[PDB]
Amino acid sequence: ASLRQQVEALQGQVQHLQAAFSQYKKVELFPNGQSVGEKIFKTAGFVKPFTEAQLLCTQAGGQLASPRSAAENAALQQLVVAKNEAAFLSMTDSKTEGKFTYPTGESLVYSNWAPGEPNDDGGSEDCVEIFTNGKWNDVACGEKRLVVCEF
Amino acid sequence: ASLRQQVEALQGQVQHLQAAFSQYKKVELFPNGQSVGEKIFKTAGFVKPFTEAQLLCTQAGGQLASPRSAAENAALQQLVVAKNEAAFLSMTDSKTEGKFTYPTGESLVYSNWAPGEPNDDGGSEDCVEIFTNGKWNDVACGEKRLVVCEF
Amino acid sequence: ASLRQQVEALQGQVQHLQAAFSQYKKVELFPNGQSVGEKIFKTAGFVKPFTEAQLLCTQAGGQLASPRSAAENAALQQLVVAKNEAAFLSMTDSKTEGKFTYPTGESLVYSNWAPGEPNDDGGSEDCVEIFTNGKWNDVACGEKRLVVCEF
Ligand SMILES: OC[C@H]1O[C@H](O[C@H]2[C@@H](O)[C@H](O)[C@@H](CO)O[C@@H]2O)[C@@H](O)[C@@H](O)[C@@H]1O
Ligand SMILES: OC[C@H]1O[C@H](O[C@H]2[C@@H](O)[C@H](O)[C@@H](CO)O[C@@H]2O)[C@@H](O)[C@@H](O)[C@@H]1O
Ligand SMILES: OC[C@H]1O[C@H](O[C@H]2[C@@H](O)[C@H](O)[C@@H](CO)O[C@@H]2O)[C@@H](O)[C@@H](O)[C@@H]1O
Ligand SMILES: [Ca+2]
Ligand SMILES: [Ca+2]
Ligand SMILES: [Ca+2]
Ligand SMILES: [Ca+2]
Ligand SMILES: [Ca+2]
Numbered sequence: 001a002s003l004r005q006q007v008e009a010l011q012g013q014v015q016h017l018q019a020a021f022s023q024y025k026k027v028e029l030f031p032n033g034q035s036v037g038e039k040i041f042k043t044a045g046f047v048k049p050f051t052e053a054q055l056l057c058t059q060a061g062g063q064l065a066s067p068r069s070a071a072e073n074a075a076l077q078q079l080v081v082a083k084n085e086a087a088f089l090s091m092t093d094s095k096t097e098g099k100f101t102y103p104t105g106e107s108l109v110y111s112n113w114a115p116g117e118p119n120d121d122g123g124s125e126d127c128v129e130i131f132t133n134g135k136w137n138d139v140a141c142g143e144k145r146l147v148v149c150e151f
Numbered sequence: 152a153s154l155r156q157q158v159e160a161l162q163g164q165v166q167h168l169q170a171a172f173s174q175y176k177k178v179e180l181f182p183n184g185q186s187v188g189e190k191i192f193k194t195a196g197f198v199k200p201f202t203e204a205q206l207l208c209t210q211a212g213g214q215l216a217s218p219r220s221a222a223e224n225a226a227l228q229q230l231v232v233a234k235n236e237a238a239f240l241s242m243t244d245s246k247t248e249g250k251f252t253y254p255t256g257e258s259l260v261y262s263n264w265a266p267g268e269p270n271d272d273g274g275s276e277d278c279v280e281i282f283t284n285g286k287w288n289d290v291a292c293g294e295k296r297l298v299v300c301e302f
Numbered sequence: 303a304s305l306r307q308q309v310e311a312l313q314g315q316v317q318h319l320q321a322a323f324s325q326y327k328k329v330e331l332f333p334n335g336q337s338v339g340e341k342i343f344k345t346a347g348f349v350k351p352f353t354e355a356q357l358l359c360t361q362a363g364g365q366l367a368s369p370r371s372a373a374e375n376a377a378l379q380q381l382v383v384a385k386n387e388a389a390f391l392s393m394t395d396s397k398t399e400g401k402f403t404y405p406t407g408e409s410l411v412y413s414n415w416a417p418g419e420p421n422d423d424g425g426s427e428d429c430v431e432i433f434t435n436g437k438w439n440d441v442a443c444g445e446k447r448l449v450v451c452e453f
């Protein structure tokens with residue numbers, strides 16, 4: 001009656017929010033965001049050394065891009081191609097050389113290394129970038145690569 | 152009194168939600184977006200040729216700015232005025248020389264041609280740009296113009 | 303009635319909506335935003351003079367950043383440091399010299415002045431900027447500093 005009518009109204013509000021929010025999400029993701037599954041990649045539009053880009057992500061409430069999938073990597077790669085800038089991933093074998101780990105300290109459930117990589121070139125390459133072709137290369141942490149954080 | 156305090160719940164949350172979403176809408180629209188009606192113009196902030204720009208928009212789940220009225224053209228000019236870059240529109244007479252149409256193929260319902268426009272200069276100008284003064288000029292689709300999508 | 307078949311509905315949506323929005327929050331605030339309480343500071347990412355910038359904010363539905371607590375101030379300081387540009391605050395003493403107020407003509411409830419500030423250098427400094435250390439300074443309103451709106 002008066003409850004029928006006000007739930008019926010609660011109905012319209014929630015539909016209005018889904019359409020509005022839906023169109024808003026599109027707006028947010030253009031042009032510096034990629035959506036794939038339940039994760040979002042977003043670029044900061046610029047480049048920084050690993051430690052500098054790493055802290056950018058953590059405090060924004062997310063973390064460096066950690067594609068655990070060829071699908072996540074291809075989307076991330078869509079972002080890297082776009083800026084025409086190779087980007088850091090979250091992974092680092094700085095604990096123990098030769099074995100790369102996610103920031104929790106876990107081990108890689110997925111990789112997309114480029115031929116010859118990782119080679120720890122110079123005896124000092126413990127971070128990872130992703131190329132415009134989507135493939136991986138371990139590299140020194142002090143190099144400035146595109147900042148892309150996952151959410 | 153049960154579902155009374157069950158729907159009074161969702162209602163509360165739906166309300167707090169609408170406030171949040173409302174403040175956040177105005178945050179994304181700053182500074183690279185305009186809201187006019189139910190349409191949302193958003194500029195990337197850089198220039199591209201028509202085809203690259205067109206792709207960008209289609210891929211963000213939208214398309215190139217297609218002002219359909221005074222009010223809409225005015226909102227779009229804002230973005231243009233602000234970036235001091237002439238932007239591209241979706242409209243083309245690539246099919247029938249002299250007949251400009253939206254991507255859907257439909258003929259124009261509004262226009263704002265600059266005095267003496269279009270002129271298909273050089274014997275080839277199939278695309279459209281909006282100036283900082285609002286008026287329209289046709290241009291070669293190879294030109295790099297400001298990218299602005301509509302959602 | 304059959305209403306309990308429909309509140310079981312609003313429930314799930316509101317749930318899905320709230321979670322989905324909660325993630326785009328972190329998404330949007332990166333890299334140019336910072337929340338603090340229920341206020342958001344958002345940088346336009348460039349520098350303009352007081353008059354021009356205060357308009358970009360007021361036309362975006364907001365206003366020039368008005369930190370009113372040590373917290374709100376610390377948050378704003380975050381942005382300024384990141385972009386490495388001292389930013390304008392909303393407050394001026396153009397009405398009455400030596401007397402700083404908000405756009406509401408209201409008088410300050412928090413300040414974090416640099417030592418010996420404000421000094422109205424050359425008797426021509428009616429505006430406020432905030433340094434990369436969080437400290438305040440009264441500057442020429444004609445000067446161009448970082449644009450940051452509070453929403
Ligand atoms: O910084 C120069 C060079 O560094 C990176 O790659 C280097 C090394 O990591 C690779 O193993 C070898 C062979 O693949 O090439 C470089 O020595 C990349 O950032 C690369 O793009 C860059 O030119
Ligand atoms: O790319 C050069 C020039 O192209 C466009 O305008 C040209 C033509 O379309 C106009 O009809 C004439 C008359 O003003 O001007 C040019 O010839 C514009 O995009 C223009 O800004 C640009 O310089
Ligand atoms: O652009 C010069 C200078 O202006 C501002 O500071 C000036 C004045 O307002 C200060 O009171 C004194 C003492 O700190 O310094 C200057 O004279 C600031 O905007 C400053 O960053 C700037 O370099
Ligand atoms: Ca090592
Ligand atoms: Ca290594
Ligand atoms: Ca290497
Ligand atoms: Ca033609
Ligand atoms: Ca033509």
Ligand SMILES: [Ca+2]
Pocket residue numbers: 268269270271272276288289290
């Ligand atoms: Ca022309």
Ligand SMILES: [Ca+2]
Pocket residue numbers: 395396399425426427428
């Ligand atoms: Ca004065």
Ligand SMILES: [Ca+2]
Pocket residue numbers: 395399400422426427428429440
């Ligand atoms: Ca003064």
Ligand SMILES: [Ca+2]
Pocket residue numbers: 419420421422423427439440441
């Ligand atoms: Ca001063």
